[PDB]
Ligand binder design. Sequence first.
Ligand SMILES: [Mg+2]
Ligand SMILES: [Mg+2]
Ligand SMILES: [Mg+2]
Ligand SMILES: [Mg+2]
Ligand SMILES: [Mg+2]
Ligand SMILES: [Mg+2]
Ligand SMILES: [Mg+2]
Ligand SMILES: [Mg+2]
Ligand SMILES: [Mg+2]
Ligand SMILES: [Mg+2]
Ligand SMILES: [Mg+2]
Ligand SMILES: [Mg+2]
Ligand SMILES: [Mg+2]
Ligand SMILES: [Mg+2]
Ligand SMILES: [Mg+2]
Ligand SMILES: [Mg+2]
Ligand SMILES: [Mg+2]
Ligand SMILES: [Mg+2]
Ligand SMILES: [Mg+2]
Ligand SMILES: [Mg+2]
Ligand SMILES: [Mg+2]
Ligand SMILES: [Mg+2]
Ligand SMILES: [Mg+2]
Ligand SMILES: [Mg+2]
Ligand SMILES: [Mg+2]
Ligand SMILES: [Mg+2]
Ligand SMILES: [Mg+2]
Ligand SMILES: [Mg+2]
Ligand SMILES: [Mg+2]
Ligand SMILES: [Mg+2]
Ligand SMILES: [Mg+2]
Ligand SMILES: [Mg+2]
Ligand SMILES: [Mg+2]
Ligand SMILES: [Mg+2]
Ligand SMILES: [Mg+2]
Ligand SMILES: [Mg+2]
Ligand SMILES: [Mg+2]
Ligand SMILES: [Mg+2]
Ligand SMILES: [Mg+2]
Ligand SMILES: [Mg+2]
Ligand SMILES: [Mg+2]
Ligand SMILES: [Mg+2]
Ligand SMILES: [Mg+2]
Ligand SMILES: [Mg+2]
Ligand SMILES: [Mg+2]
Ligand SMILES: [Mg+2]
Ligand SMILES: [Mg+2]
Ligand SMILES: [Mg+2]
Ligand SMILES: [Mg+2]
Ligand SMILES: [Mg+2]
Ligand SMILES: [Mg+2]
Ligand SMILES: [Mg+2]
Ligand SMILES: [Mg+2]
Ligand SMILES: [Mg+2]
Ligand SMILES: [Mg+2]
Ligand SMILES: [Mg+2]
Ligand SMILES: [Mg+2]
Ligand SMILES: [Mg+2]
Ligand SMILES: [Mg+2]
Ligand SMILES: [Mg+2]
Ligand SMILES: [Mg+2]
Ligand SMILES: [Mg+2]
Ligand SMILES: [Mg+2]
Ligand SMILES: [Mg+2]
Ligand SMILES: [Mg+2]
Ligand SMILES: [Mg+2]
Ligand SMILES: [Mg+2]
Ligand SMILES: [Mg+2]
Ligand SMILES: [Mg+2]
Ligand SMILES: [Mg+2]
Ligand SMILES: [Mg+2]
Ligand SMILES: [Mg+2]
Ligand SMILES: [Mg+2]
Ligand SMILES: [Mg+2]
Ligand SMILES: [Mg+2]
Ligand SMILES: [Mg+2]
Ligand SMILES: [Mg+2]
Ligand SMILES: [Mg+2]
Ligand SMILES: [Mg+2]
Ligand SMILES: [Mg+2]
Ligand SMILES: [Mg+2]
Ligand SMILES: [Mg+2]
Ligand SMILES: [Mg+2]
Ligand SMILES: [Mg+2]
Ligand SMILES: [Mg+2]
Ligand SMILES: [Mg+2]
Ligand SMILES: [Mg+2]
Ligand SMILES: [Mg+2]
Ligand SMILES: [Mg+2]
Ligand SMILES: [Mg+2]
Ligand SMILES: [Mg+2]
Ligand SMILES: [Mg+2]
Ligand SMILES: [Mg+2]
Ligand SMILES: [Mg+2]
Ligand SMILES: [Mg+2]
Ligand SMILES: [Mg+2]
Ligand SMILES: [Mg+2]
Ligand SMILES: [Mg+2]
Ligand SMILES: [Mg+2]
Ligand SMILES: [Mg+2]
Ligand SMILES: [Mg+2]
Ligand SMILES: [Mg+2]
Ligand SMILES: [Mg+2]
Ligand SMILES: [Mg+2]
Ligand SMILES: [Mg+2]
Ligand SMILES: [Mg+2]
Ligand SMILES: [Mg+2]
Ligand SMILES: [Mg+2]
Ligand SMILES: [Mg+2]
Ligand SMILES: [Mg+2]
Ligand SMILES: [Mg+2]
Ligand SMILES: [Mg+2]
Ligand SMILES: [Mg+2]
Ligand SMILES: [Mg+2]
Ligand SMILES: [Mg+2]
Ligand SMILES: [Mg+2]
Ligand SMILES: [Mg+2]
Ligand SMILES: [Mg+2]
Ligand SMILES: [Mg+2]
Ligand SMILES: [Mg+2]
Ligand SMILES: [Mg+2]
Ligand SMILES: [Mg+2]
Ligand SMILES: [Mg+2]
Ligand SMILES: [Mg+2]
Ligand SMILES: [Mg+2]
Ligand SMILES: [Mg+2]
Ligand SMILES: [Mg+2]
Ligand SMILES: [Mg+2]
Ligand SMILES: [Mg+2]
Ligand SMILES: [Mg+2]
Ligand SMILES: [Mg+2]
Ligand SMILES: [Mg+2]
Ligand SMILES: [Mg+2]
Ligand SMILES: [Mg+2]
Ligand SMILES: [Mg+2]
Ligand SMILES: [Mg+2]
Ligand SMILES: [Mg+2]
Ligand SMILES: [Mg+2]
Ligand SMILES: [Mg+2]
Ligand SMILES: [Mg+2]
Ligand SMILES: [Mg+2]
Ligand SMILES: [Mg+2]
Ligand SMILES: [Mg+2]
Ligand SMILES: [Mg+2]
Ligand SMILES: [Mg+2]
Ligand SMILES: [Mg+2]
Ligand SMILES: [Mg+2]
Ligand SMILES: [Mg+2]
Ligand SMILES: [Mg+2]
Ligand SMILES: [Mg+2]
Ligand SMILES: [Mg+2]
Ligand SMILES: [Mg+2]
Ligand SMILES: [Mg+2]
Ligand SMILES: [Mg+2]
Ligand SMILES: [Mg+2]
Ligand SMILES: [Mg+2]
Ligand SMILES: [Mg+2]
Ligand SMILES: [Mg+2]
Ligand SMILES: [Mg+2]
Ligand SMILES: [Mg+2]
Ligand SMILES: [Mg+2]
Ligand SMILES: [Mg+2]
Lengths: 47, 273
Amino acid sequence: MKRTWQPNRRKRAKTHGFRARMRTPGGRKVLKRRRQKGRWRLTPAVR
Amino acid sequence: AVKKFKPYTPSRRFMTVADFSEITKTEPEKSLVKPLKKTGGRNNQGRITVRFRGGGHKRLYRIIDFKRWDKVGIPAKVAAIEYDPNRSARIALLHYVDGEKRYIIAPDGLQVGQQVVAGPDAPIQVGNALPLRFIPVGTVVHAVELEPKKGAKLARAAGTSAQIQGREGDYVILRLPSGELRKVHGECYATVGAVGNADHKNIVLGKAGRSRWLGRRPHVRGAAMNPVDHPHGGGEGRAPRGRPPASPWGWQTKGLKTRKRRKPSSRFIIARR
RNA sequence: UCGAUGUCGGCUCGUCGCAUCCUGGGGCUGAAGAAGGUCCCAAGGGUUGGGCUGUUCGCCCAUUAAAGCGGCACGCGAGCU
RNA sequence: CGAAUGCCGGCAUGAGUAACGAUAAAGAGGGUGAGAAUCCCUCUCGCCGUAAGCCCAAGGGUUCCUACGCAAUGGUCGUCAGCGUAGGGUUAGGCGGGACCUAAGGUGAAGCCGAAAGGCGUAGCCGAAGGGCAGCCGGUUAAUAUUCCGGCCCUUCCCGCAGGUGCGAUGGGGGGACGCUCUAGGCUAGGGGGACCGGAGCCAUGGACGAGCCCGGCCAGAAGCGCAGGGUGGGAGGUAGGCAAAUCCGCCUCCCAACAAGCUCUGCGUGGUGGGGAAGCCCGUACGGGUGACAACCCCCCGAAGCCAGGGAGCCAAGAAAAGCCUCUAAGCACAACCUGCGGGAACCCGUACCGCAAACCGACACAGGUGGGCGGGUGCAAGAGCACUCAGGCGCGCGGGAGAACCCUCGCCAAGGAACUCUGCAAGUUGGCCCCGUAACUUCGGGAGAAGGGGUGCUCCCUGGGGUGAUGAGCCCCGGGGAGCCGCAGUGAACAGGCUCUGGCGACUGUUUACCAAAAACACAGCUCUCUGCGAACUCGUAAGAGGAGGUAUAGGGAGCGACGCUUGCCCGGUGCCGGAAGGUCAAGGGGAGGGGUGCAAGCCCCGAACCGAAGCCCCGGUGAACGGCGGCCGUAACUAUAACGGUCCUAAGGUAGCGAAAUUCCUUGUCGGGUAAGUUCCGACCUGCACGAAAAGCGUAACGACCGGAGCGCUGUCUCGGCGAGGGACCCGGUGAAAUUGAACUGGCCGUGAAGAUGCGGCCUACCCGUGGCAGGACGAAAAGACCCCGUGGAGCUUUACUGCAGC
RNA sequence: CGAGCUAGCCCUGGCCAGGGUGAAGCUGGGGUGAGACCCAGUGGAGGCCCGAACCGGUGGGGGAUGCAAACCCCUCGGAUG
RNA sequence: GUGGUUCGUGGAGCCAUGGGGGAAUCUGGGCGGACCACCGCCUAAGGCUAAGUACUCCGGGUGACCGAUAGCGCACCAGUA
RNA sequence: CGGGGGGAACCUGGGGAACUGAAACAUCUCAGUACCCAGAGGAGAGGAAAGAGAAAUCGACUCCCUGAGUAGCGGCGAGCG
RNA sequence: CGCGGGGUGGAGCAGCCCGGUAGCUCGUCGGGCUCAUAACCCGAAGGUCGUCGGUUCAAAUCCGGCCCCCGCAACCA
RNA sequence: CCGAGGGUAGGGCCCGUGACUGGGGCGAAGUCGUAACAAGGUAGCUGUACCGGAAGGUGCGGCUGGACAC
RNA sequence: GUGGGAGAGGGUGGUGGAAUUCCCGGAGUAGCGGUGAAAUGCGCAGAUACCGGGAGGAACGCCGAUGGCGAAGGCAGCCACCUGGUCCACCCGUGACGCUGAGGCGCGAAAGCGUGGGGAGCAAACCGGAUUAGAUACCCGGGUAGUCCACGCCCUAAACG
Ligand SMILES: [Mg+2]
Ligand SMILES: [Mg+2]
Ligand SMILES: [Mg+2]
Ligand SMILES: [Mg+2]
Ligand SMILES: [Mg+2]
Ligand SMILES: [Mg+2]
Ligand SMILES: [Mg+2]
Ligand SMILES: [Mg+2]
Ligand SMILES: [Mg+2]
Ligand SMILES: [Mg+2]
Ligand SMILES: [Mg+2]
Ligand SMILES: [Mg+2]
Ligand SMILES: [Mg+2]
Ligand SMILES: [Mg+2]
Ligand SMILES: [Mg+2]
Ligand SMILES: [Mg+2]
Ligand SMILES: [Mg+2]
Ligand SMILES: [Mg+2]
Ligand SMILES: [Mg+2]
Ligand SMILES: [Mg+2]
Ligand SMILES: [Mg+2]
Ligand SMILES: [Mg+2]
Ligand SMILES: [Mg+2]
Ligand SMILES: [Mg+2]
Ligand SMILES: [Mg+2]
Ligand SMILES: [Mg+2]
Ligand SMILES: [Mg+2]
Ligand SMILES: [Mg+2]
Ligand SMILES: [Mg+2]
Ligand SMILES: [Mg+2]
Ligand SMILES: [Mg+2]
Ligand SMILES: [Mg+2]
Ligand SMILES: [Mg+2]
Ligand SMILES: [Mg+2]
Ligand SMILES: [Mg+2]
Ligand SMILES: [Mg+2]
Ligand SMILES: [Mg+2]
Ligand SMILES: [Mg+2]
Ligand SMILES: [Mg+2]
Ligand SMILES: [Mg+2]
Ligand SMILES: [Mg+2]
Ligand SMILES: [Mg+2]
Ligand SMILES: [Mg+2]
Ligand SMILES: [Mg+2]
Ligand SMILES: [Mg+2]
Ligand SMILES: [Mg+2]
Ligand SMILES: [Mg+2]
Ligand SMILES: [Mg+2]
Ligand SMILES: [Mg+2]
Ligand SMILES: [Mg+2]
Ligand SMILES: [Mg+2]
Ligand SMILES: [Mg+2]
Ligand SMILES: [Mg+2]
Ligand SMILES: [Mg+2]
Ligand SMILES: [Mg+2]
Ligand SMILES: [Mg+2]
Ligand SMILES: [Mg+2]
Ligand SMILES: [Mg+2]
Ligand SMILES: [Mg+2]
Ligand SMILES: [Mg+2]
Ligand SMILES: [Mg+2]
Ligand SMILES: [Mg+2]
Ligand SMILES: [Mg+2]
Ligand SMILES: [Mg+2]
Ligand SMILES: [Mg+2]
Ligand SMILES: [Mg+2]
Ligand SMILES: [Mg+2]
Ligand SMILES: [Mg+2]
Ligand SMILES: [Mg+2]
Ligand SMILES: [Mg+2]
Ligand SMILES: [Mg+2]
Ligand SMILES: [Mg+2]
Ligand SMILES: [Mg+2]
Ligand SMILES: [Mg+2]
Ligand SMILES: [Mg+2]
Ligand SMILES: [Mg+2]
Ligand SMILES: [Mg+2]
Ligand SMILES: [Mg+2]
Ligand SMILES: [Mg+2]
Ligand SMILES: [Mg+2]
Ligand SMILES: [Mg+2]
Ligand SMILES: [Mg+2]
Ligand SMILES: [Mg+2]
Ligand SMILES: [Mg+2]
Ligand SMILES: [Mg+2]
Ligand SMILES: [Mg+2]
Ligand SMILES: [Mg+2]
Ligand SMILES: [Mg+2]
Ligand SMILES: [Mg+2]
Ligand SMILES: [Mg+2]
Ligand SMILES: [Mg+2]
Ligand SMILES: [Mg+2]
Ligand SMILES: [Mg+2]
Ligand SMILES: [Mg+2]
Ligand SMILES: [Mg+2]
Ligand SMILES: [Mg+2]
Ligand SMILES: [Mg+2]
Ligand SMILES: [Mg+2]
Ligand SMILES: [Mg+2]
Ligand SMILES: [Mg+2]
Ligand SMILES: [Mg+2]
Ligand SMILES: [Mg+2]
Ligand SMILES: [Mg+2]
Ligand SMILES: [Mg+2]
Ligand SMILES: [Mg+2]
Ligand SMILES: [Mg+2]
Ligand SMILES: [Mg+2]
Ligand SMILES: [Mg+2]
Ligand SMILES: [Mg+2]
Ligand SMILES: [Mg+2]
Ligand SMILES: [Mg+2]
Ligand SMILES: [Mg+2]
Ligand SMILES: [Mg+2]
Ligand SMILES: [Mg+2]
Ligand SMILES: [Mg+2]
Ligand SMILES: [Mg+2]
Ligand SMILES: [Mg+2]
Ligand SMILES: [Mg+2]
Ligand SMILES: [Mg+2]
Ligand SMILES: [Mg+2]
Ligand SMILES: [Mg+2]
Ligand SMILES: [Mg+2]
Ligand SMILES: [Mg+2]
Ligand SMILES: [Mg+2]
Ligand SMILES: [Mg+2]
Ligand SMILES: [Mg+2]
Ligand SMILES: [Mg+2]
Ligand SMILES: [Mg+2]
Ligand SMILES: [Mg+2]
Ligand SMILES: [Mg+2]
Ligand SMILES: [Mg+2]
Ligand SMILES: [Mg+2]
Ligand SMILES: [Mg+2]
Ligand SMILES: [Mg+2]
Ligand SMILES: [Mg+2]
Ligand SMILES: [Mg+2]
Ligand SMILES: [Mg+2]
Ligand SMILES: [Mg+2]
Ligand SMILES: [Mg+2]
Ligand SMILES: [Mg+2]
Ligand SMILES: [Mg+2]
Ligand SMILES: [Mg+2]
Ligand SMILES: [Mg+2]
Ligand SMILES: [Mg+2]
Ligand SMILES: [Mg+2]
Ligand SMILES: [Mg+2]
Ligand SMILES: [Mg+2]
Ligand SMILES: [Mg+2]
Ligand SMILES: [Mg+2]
Ligand SMILES: [Mg+2]
Ligand SMILES: [Mg+2]
Ligand SMILES: [Mg+2]
Ligand SMILES: [Mg+2]
Ligand SMILES: [Mg+2]
Ligand SMILES: [Mg+2]
Ligand SMILES: [Mg+2]
Ligand SMILES: [Mg+2]
Ligand SMILES: [Mg+2]
Ligand SMILES: [Mg+2]
Ligand SMILES: [Mg+2]
Ligand SMILES: [Mg+2]
Ligand SMILES: [Mg+2]
């Protein structure tokens, strides 16, 4: 039965993308947190 | 007037359709159309600010002329009468002799062969448009400017009209479709006659779906909700209103008058009994 | 017994008690006979099908030798409904 | 540290137990190899075939091809693989996207708003499965190909030559450019047939050397031409409109064509040319290669939902945009420029493997689930994408071998009976397609209707009608009609196809719903009523700007109730709500300064402060019921009796009208009577004593409708009397692999007692050799879940109001 | 931080085998003073009918450490709105 | 009307200021806790100013600090799988 | 010429909770904490008296000790200070 | 069992709260108007206040027990 | 082949009958009132509509078969 | 036929004044209404009575009759348009072409019904005041449908001479 993950490459980068994060002050601090944590990827990697 | 149907389905039983024989033209005048929103009843916040709207046939917006006075004294011929699906009434196509084409709300009795003009010059005749000050008292008239040069806001709906009851100073007294008596400025353009397609009110939608086609989605009553949703929500099965009947937002919906008390517009109104 | 002892009724499977419904054996009778009444012994076996209602009860139909009353977590849901 | 359903880890028990993931199915021979049910090859058998085949998009990301491997992954095995190592492999001016357009929306010079972060916003920009745009057929690789190659076509840019023209745009105009249903003519895709054409070869087992059987009989292709369609008038004058200007477009007039006439564009056909090209046989293939062949390469028929396409008609709910393109002019330039034709040159980036209804995507799994577009052949059955079988192609579902117990599942059949089963015909049966006859109450005249109930149904021969194609003909294809006969238990001979009637309740109807225990009598619904709202509307969202409402305007819009339709919808305005009321009462800040006070020597400075003027609100006066709501009590009375039309009296704002009524409502209740039944707590019809119906939280009805809920009959049955047999998949046995909750430890019997009140564990007595397998559930107060019920906690949350208090709003 | 599930709306596309019923209108004939209307043919309407795909999820059985954290079988509802 | 201070309206000054009114320039003005007098303090409505202060990504030194279930989440290719 | 963005914690400013405490709770508390935003910098803030406040006194600011859990504040409650 | 209200001339209601005094309508009785009846007019009679205790000087009135009547309630189970 | 009848199924008419229910007829002395016949004490009657224990009342319109004073 | 006439005959569209009602302005005070008598109602929040302004609906005084017209029902301010019946004079045409009329068709007062409008006065129902033994009546104060228009039904009558 249809489940929750219906991957679509444009939906991901439009939503969690790096330009998404930078546009909203909420999202900049996302990056800030993940960068301060040392996350290897600050943002979903979609191909 | 008002096509009926044999009941070869339920609801084709009581359904009733407009008589379209007034209509002389089907495709609208491409120069004169624009596309629509349409809003689903949602404002720029994405939020529904008007409940129970959506769906409904796609529509092209006929641009229509509510200032007749930019064209003063230039006559025009009535080319066609067609369906505007944004409004209760019908649109008349006017070829002016400038060669400019515009759409007008089609008054009751307007024929397409005929000539119409706007200005104080203006024979008092169906379709012509004048400053209110130059219409003879007792005339019935439609598409009225409420303030001068601001466009026609009054009596535009299928079958509506207003009468001139008299003049006082720079102002003239009108009886609006509501029956409010209010002063309108004499300088306000109006166009003699009633609106027509007045048979409009006897259409009988006849089945739910026909209501959808008009973009009206189902309407659910407060009684059918729960207390979170609505002052009428809850109870065990059925229930009187249990309080003075209210809107979902909580104000009383029987008799409570919402018009602002102090509006300057109040100096110009005498009525509505 | 609340860090759970699943509740009515039905179905299935029973088992026991006897304060015995039938069958067996008795005493008394206001027992002529046949048929009853009443009490005594007796638990071996037996104790119907159906209409109504979720019913248990109960009422009713057609029979019967009889259409017994109780207990078993009002027996029985790691057996079913 | 011994306990915290503690924490982390390790290892146990259950147990060699359940299970090994669709019941589409396997068998043998040969090969390989240390080793083979499982890998490869062949033969046989089975399964899919509107797929379980093929193509595309997503998503996935090397899984692709090949060599070498088998520790692990693979539910067994593995010599194999989507697995390990390594190597290779994805080729574009034309396909997709980008150096094009715009849609929702997004963003946003201007601008507006917001403590800050930010919000909005015209133009513009961005944004596509929409618009625009030039590649078709074949061959080739282990692996890519509209990408390479072959052949034949085309596009843009740049430059040039020639010829033509007032050239020129982001500006004006045209166009692009549009719905749903039905649908004409001509095509094509695809398909069937042929006695005609081409082809290895076959005569079996009784017959057949045959007009036999088997196989095949095409594809792409510029110009030109042909057929079929789309688009479209031409000329002149006037002109004030298309935010400058146009010669364009618009409009008025006049003048010819009236027609696709022509011009133009597209479809199909044909076309120089190029290319494919079966069975079978041979070899040899994970794959395909020789030959067949110098292959043939043709007639007829069926025929799209596709094409011509901006076709046609009808309808109402009235059906994107911008660019390409054309035209018009403005600057500007008229050596320029642009148009047309020819020629040369130039033509970038990204994708391109592979899976793709699934073992490669979403579901933790090689998971019976989910996933959008296209193609989807043949025959038969009325049609069809249905059903059965079958091409191409693809599969036998990654444990097997046996046995033939209980039991379970899924399936077949049954004497007689036929609902007696049971909450209930639950379930299963019956019925079942087409054609013909026929068909009630009632009805809103449509319906009810597939009502009901019947008959027909195959095959053969003879005769005969009309159609489409052709000619008006045969041939082929379609729809029929009549007559005589043949066989069987049976002719919709298999497969896919309603059981029906009577009668209540509720809801008018089709719809909607609690994803994952409720599909309904709930919601919605057309329709009726109330109410607000004059337009910078009310209302809603937002601090605001702004937006929705609406590019709407009272025949509109918002809120509320009621809920098709019929006939209807009574009385009460005391209370509450709302509506009206220019008086009156009260009323806050403020105005007013009577008088009083502090302190100074004082001028003064400072503090109280009565009257009186003073909003809304409340009070007060009215109104208002499809506003919240509410619509009586006791006693008497008629010439049998009973009852009480009548009366008395108390109270009220007013005392329930019509209709209906033991009801989805009736306690007593299985009310009483009648009907159905042999028997009826249900059901239907009545009565009225309505605990506790009643008129838009509408009253009473209503044809039609319903996977709703009740009651009855017929038909028919394994529901039952009442069980029996049979099939398969499991269960059992053997080989491979091998879990789980639970588990204080155990050397874990019965009765009668006792015990914290229900004892394997204490007393007494009885019984009892050790250990298992298959079975059944009575007990271990069995497992599971720190009981949801109940209470407790000055625990929590959702909801309400004439609880308190406050805030938005007004 | 989430509307890649789900709910509504917005923009742009696509899908719905086959069969059945036979509204209005049109045409002809009747009819009349002119009508209404009546019949026939034509036509091809509809939250019309049967039924695949597609969308559902009625009843029952199975499953219940599942194939599956909602599945399978049979049956059944809608299928131009 | 509020905030700040110990100051919750209190006898409530001081400092700050959203609203209304609104001066003067040494004989001017603010303050010493309502207010008045007196005696004092101080010169608002412009600005800058080292150091003594806080902190520890980084480098060092030192522990009656841990010693791979400890010590940072990470002694190990960890903000990884 | 300059700005933009980053920086563990520290700093200033703009804004600013609730659990909790009060053994219920509204004033009060938690707390100008958490957090969000803006700015600094290697620090930041503050700073040279229209100050204190009782002495005819002190003399910018910041930080420590003390004054002192004092003065006070307070449903004069918890508690704040 | 529970809680609230009641029992007063023949009927139906006051009075009880706040002790002393029993009232209203109807009915009944006597008289009148009328041929008569009713209507109508003029007069009258009629009561220990459910009961039994108690309190007080004094009880329909206050308190209690009993008896009736009406109403409400009986939930989770 | 036709065929008396038999059977299964669905209609039509007619009769009897049925809890209960509608009114009607009739019946020496029942209850409530007075609608009508005399201006019947509101002229009556009337088709229709609403209401009401009951006769009847009221509205609209009609008919006369109703009319010496002020 | 021709030439004439009378008429509220019918259908449509206009239009006038009187009056009632409501609203505004003015002025003005303590009652107005109403009946048998009263009361309900209305009125110092300014009623009634008076003057002026405005809105709207219905009906058409005098002429008017003991009249005219129509088949009946019915039809009445004024104007115009369309249109029916009918009478008279001349003796001009047709030549019995007539009369009645089961069925059929049409019209048919009031009230009533449906969908819309409109709603001033009146007014079933309904409320209240009074009368009365009662008064679901008669009188009085209120008052909805209706009365009016359009279209469509109903089709009755002391539809009577
Ligand atoms: Mg789906
Ligand atoms: Mg995509
Ligand atoms: Mg890295
Ligand atoms: Mg947004
Ligand atoms: Mg609506
Ligand atoms: Mg609704
Ligand atoms: Mg609900
Ligand atoms: Mg609420
Ligand atoms: Mg409620
Ligand atoms: Mg409810
Ligand atoms: Mg209820
Ligand atoms: Mg317990
Ligand atoms: Mg517990
Ligand atoms: Mg049981
Ligand atoms: Mg015995
Ligand atoms: Mg004997
Ligand atoms: Mg025995
Ligand atoms: Mg026994
Ligand atoms: Mg039963
Ligand atoms: Mg019983
Ligand atoms: Mg058990
Ligand atoms: Mg159970
Ligand atoms: Mg048990
Ligand atoms: Mg048990
Ligand atoms: Mg311990
Ligand atoms: Mg446990
Ligand atoms: Mg432990
Ligand atoms: Mg083991
Ligand atoms: Mg075991
Ligand atoms: Mg086993
Ligand atoms: Mg097994
Ligand atoms: Mg398997
Ligand atoms: Mg296998
Ligand atoms: Mg096939
Ligand atoms: Mg291996
Ligand atoms: Mg596996
Ligand atoms: Mg190429
Ligand atoms: Mg190419
Ligand atoms: Mg491209
Ligand atoms: Mg370029
Ligand atoms: Mg663009
Ligand atoms: Mg763009
Ligand atoms: Mg924005
Ligand atoms: Mg901004
Ligand atoms: Mg773009
Ligand atoms: Mg595109
Ligand atoms: Mg495209
Ligand atoms: Mg292209
Ligand atoms: Mg190719
Ligand atoms: Mg040009
Ligand atoms: Mg389009
Ligand atoms: Mg072709
Ligand atoms: Mg042979
Ligand atoms: Mg053909
Ligand atoms: Mg077209
Ligand atoms: Mg349509
Ligand atoms: Mg553009
Ligand atoms: Mg120039
Ligand atoms: Mg490729
Ligand atoms: Mg695969
Ligand atoms: Mg599938
Ligand atoms: Mg597919
Ligand atoms: Mg597998
Ligand atoms: Mg799968
Ligand atoms: Mg699918
Ligand atoms: Mg078929
Ligand atoms: Mg097959
Ligand atoms: Mg094959
Ligand atoms: Mg057999
Ligand atoms: Mg049998
Ligand atoms: Mg039978
Ligand atoms: Mg039943
Ligand atoms: Mg069934
Ligand atoms: Mg019948
Ligand atoms: Mg049949
Ligand atoms: Mg045969
Ligand atoms: Mg069959
Ligand atoms: Mg069948
Ligand atoms: Mg069927
Ligand atoms: Mg019932
Ligand atoms: Mg329904
Ligand atoms: Mg449907
Ligand atoms: Mg619902
Ligand atoms: Mg559900
Ligand atoms: Mg749920
Ligand atoms: Mg769920
Ligand atoms: Mg349903
Ligand atoms: Mg209705
Ligand atoms: Mg707001
Ligand atoms: Mg708009
Ligand atoms: Mg409802
Ligand atoms: Mg009231
Ligand atoms: Mg009120
Ligand atoms: Mg009142
Ligand atoms: Mg003074
Ligand atoms: Mg006031
Ligand atoms: Mg009512
Ligand atoms: Mg009543
Ligand atoms: Mg009853
Ligand atoms: Mg009964
Ligand atoms: Mg009841
Ligand atoms: Mg029942
Ligand atoms: Mg009944
Ligand atoms: Mg009810
Ligand atoms: Mg109601
Ligand atoms: Mg009913
Ligand atoms: Mg019904
Ligand atoms: Mg349905
Ligand atoms: Mg249903
Ligand atoms: Mg059986
Ligand atoms: Mg077997
Ligand atoms: Mg032992
Ligand atoms: Mg024991
Ligand atoms: Mg022991
Ligand atoms: Mg057991
Ligand atoms: Mg347990
Ligand atoms: Mg408490
Ligand atoms: Mg609490
Ligand atoms: Mg979604
Ligand atoms: Mg969505
Ligand atoms: Mg079809
Ligand atoms: Mg059809
Ligand atoms: Mg349908
Ligand atoms: Mg169907
Ligand atoms: Mg299901
Ligand atoms: Mg089940
Ligand atoms: Mg089970
Ligand atoms: Mg649609
Ligand atoms: Mg303060
Ligand atoms: Mg205080
Ligand atoms: Mg203070
Ligand atoms: Mg001071
Ligand atoms: Mg001074
Ligand atoms: Mg100061
Ligand atoms: Mg000081
Ligand atoms: Mg002082
Ligand atoms: Mg100082
Ligand atoms: Mg200074
Ligand atoms: Mg050490
Ligand atoms: Mg370690
Ligand atoms: Mg560690
Ligand atoms: Mg170690
Ligand atoms: Mg760690
Ligand atoms: Mg701050
Ligand atoms: Mg607390
Ligand atoms: Mg506490
Ligand atoms: Mg609490
Ligand atoms: Mg604080
Ligand atoms: Mg701060
Ligand atoms: Mg330094
Ligand atoms: Mg510093
Ligand atoms: Mg420093
Ligand atoms: Mg500073
Ligand atoms: Mg409760
Ligand atoms: Mg009378
Ligand atoms: Mg009389
Ligand atoms: Mg009389
Ligand atoms: Mg009356
Ligand atoms: Mg005649
Ligand atoms: Mg009539
Ligand atoms: Mg009438
Ligand atoms: Mg009288």
